[PDB]
Design an enzyme around this catalytic site. Structure first.
Site, PDB file in Angstrom:
ATOM      1  N   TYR A  38      -6.639  -3.968   1.383  1.00 52.48           N
ATOM      2  CA  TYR A  38      -6.839  -5.173   0.463  1.00 52.48           C
ATOM      3  C   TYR A  38      -5.909  -6.161   1.075  1.00 52.48           C
ATOM      4  CZ  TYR A  38      -6.998  -7.759  -3.832  1.00 52.48           C
ATOM      5  OH  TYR A  38      -7.166  -8.591  -4.803  1.00 52.48           O
ATOM      6  N   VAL A  41      -8.760 -13.981  -4.708  1.00 55.02           N
ATOM      7  CA  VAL A  41      -9.148 -12.700  -4.344  1.00 55.02           C
ATOM      8  C   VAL A  41      -9.312 -11.894  -5.721  1.00 55.02           C
ATOM      9  CG1 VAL A  41      -6.743 -11.899  -4.231  1.00 55.02           C
ATOM     10  CG2 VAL A  41      -8.566 -10.883  -2.845  1.00 55.02           C
ATOM     11  N   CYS A  42      -9.776 -10.819  -5.736  1.00 56.56           N
ATOM     12  CA  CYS A  42     -10.095 -10.117  -6.716  1.00 56.56           C
ATOM     13  C   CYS A  42      -9.594  -8.675  -6.878  1.00 56.56           C
ATOM     14  CB  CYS A  42     -11.474 -10.065  -7.396  1.00 56.56           C
ATOM     15  SG  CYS A  42     -11.767 -10.768  -9.061  1.00 56.56           S
ATOM     16  N   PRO A  43      -8.615  -8.035  -7.671  1.00 59.29           N
ATOM     17  CA  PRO A  43      -8.283  -6.959  -7.641  1.00 59.29           C
ATOM     18  C   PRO A  43      -9.110  -5.883  -8.204  1.00 59.29           C
ATOM     19  CG  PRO A  43      -7.541  -7.869  -9.507  1.00 59.29           C
ATOM     20  CD  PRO A  43      -8.086  -8.953  -8.514  1.00 59.29           C
ATOM     21  N   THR A  44     -10.145  -6.141  -8.767  1.00 57.59           N
ATOM     22  CA  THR A  44     -10.988  -5.328  -9.300  1.00 57.59           C
ATOM     23  C   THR A  44     -11.924  -4.165  -8.255  1.00 57.59           C
ATOM     24  OG1 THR A  44     -12.593  -7.323  -9.048  1.00 57.59           O
ATOM     25  CG2 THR A  44     -11.845  -6.818 -11.179  1.00 57.59           C
TER      26      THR A  44
END
Lengths: 168, 163
Positions: A38, A41-44
């Site tokens: 990772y 930005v998206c943590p999903t």
């Protein structure tokens, strides 16, 4: 280092069950490993894996997320509710790689920008590289596809490294 | 050579529309390119994969993308391959070009050659409209690739390129 090669061994401190633990790739012998990066930005995306963690456990595989940052800030990230962008209660280990030596070892490190590409890697029970997805930063990964690859490689290793013409 | 890099140039004789035609990578600018390697010499390979890609070509064309298969043999063998019924082991009518790679220089240029088996790994590569590498799937030989996933990746990249 590419596919069909013995996968680069990795170690370091991760956040597991809300706590910092030294983990090594050699600790996961006998189980498949989905190692995915990772970029900090998206943590999903990482959250998604964490939610589907049980499905991954049905197949005796261990998902390990890797990010270009410290174990303490990763703890800070887990110690944040998802509603604020944090990770909340994670069910897969989040490994720290501030040195980015793991990213280089896996060839997803951009030696100009100081950031990692979205690399994903499937490692089998004998510690060899079986799959490598690598995406440019804007495009996320799909769990269903990873589960598909893993179960296919498993059926292969079980049924003599050959998959029937048109599998499920 | 990795992602975000100008993709390795490829050219050669391909089977296009049931005929042998010279294609070049520079010919496909303004369009996305799905470059994928189909290992023939894999004793347990299934054509259902590449056949699938051939069928969903319209879906690729809606997205302005050109799927190009690359296989480890000459344009003459690829023609012979196309000119063989599927119920006899051939490919039948293919709707995407099949590029020749007997020298495996194209396979080497993309880092998918197994320099022991003389075969390439199931590598798939998405290339954008200015011709830089955006995605690379590489599988070990026993596991095939999914058309739906490729479509997802391509349209995601397109939406990104617009936004």
């Amino acid at each position: 280092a590419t596919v069909r090669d013995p996968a680069p061994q990795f170690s370091g401190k991760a956040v597991v069950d809300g706590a910092i633990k030294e983990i090594n790739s050699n600790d996961y012998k006998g189980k498949y490993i989905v190692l995915f990066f990772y970029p900090m930005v998206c943590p999903t995306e990482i959250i998604a894996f964490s939610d589907r963690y049980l499905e991954f456990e049905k197949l005796n595989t261990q998902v390990i997320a890797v990010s270009c940052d410290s174990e303490y800030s990763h703890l800070a990230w887990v110690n944040t509710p998802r509603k604020k962008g944090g990770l909340g209660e994670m069910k897969i280990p989040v490994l720290a790689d501030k040195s980015m030596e793991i990213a280089r070892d896996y060839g997803v490190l951009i030696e100009s920008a100081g950031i990692a590409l979205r690399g994903l890697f499937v490692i089998d029970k004998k510690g060899t590289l079986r799959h490598s997805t690598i995406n440019d930063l804007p495009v996320g990964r799909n769990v269903d596809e990873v589960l598909r690859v893993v179960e296919a490689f498993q059926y292969a290793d079980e049924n003599g490294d050959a998959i029937p013409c048109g599998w499920t």
